[PDB]
Amino acid sequence: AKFLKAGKVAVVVRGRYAGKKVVIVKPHDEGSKSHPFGHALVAGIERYPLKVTKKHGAKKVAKRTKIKPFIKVVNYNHLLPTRYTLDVEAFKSVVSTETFEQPSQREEAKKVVKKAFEERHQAGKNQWFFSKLRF
């Protein structure tokens, strides 16, 4: 009866990313010395790709499909779990507790996440995840 697993998709509810979909990578149920609460390490989308029609040229399609990712430690109370799933094995090793608290390692993980999201978006799958929420 536990659903906050390592591939669950949730919606951020607070903190500059509210209304943006996210996928849980590493959960921490019994808190930690820092962040003494139930929290998860998540990677999400900050700038969703724009809709592409058949009239768009080669240059414009590549521009409109760019995705800007982010990584964040989020309290459980600030997430809204969904029923969707997204495999994270391609980038689970690069995001962890170590990659935070260091500016250089945060950017290295983000570009790896960006490449994974771009390839996932191409050859369309997980269409709900890449669709911007309307509110």
């Binding site: 919606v11 509810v13 500059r16 209304g19 029923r83």
Partner: protein, 103 residues
Amino acid sequence: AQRVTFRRRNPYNTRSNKIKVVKTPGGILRAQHVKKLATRPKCGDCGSALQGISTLRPRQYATVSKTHKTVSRAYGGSRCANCVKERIIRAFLIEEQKIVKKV
């Protein structure tokens, strides 16, 4: 026991003719005309005041930076955090409910 006078030609005690008594470097009491106090911007849904937003006269908002007039979040400076939280949760649950009605 010094007594003061208005510094404009309006002789009546209207909302735009408010004064405050101050003491000058010359050692005398002089009236100081003060402008009407500003009102905090209110939320679009619940109507409560918005946190992190400067309180200024309407025309003075054009003279300040964008940082003073918004909050780094969706609907920042227009709707408060709790009202934004309600919108996101309501939008997600209703859209999920529409799918189960379709099938």
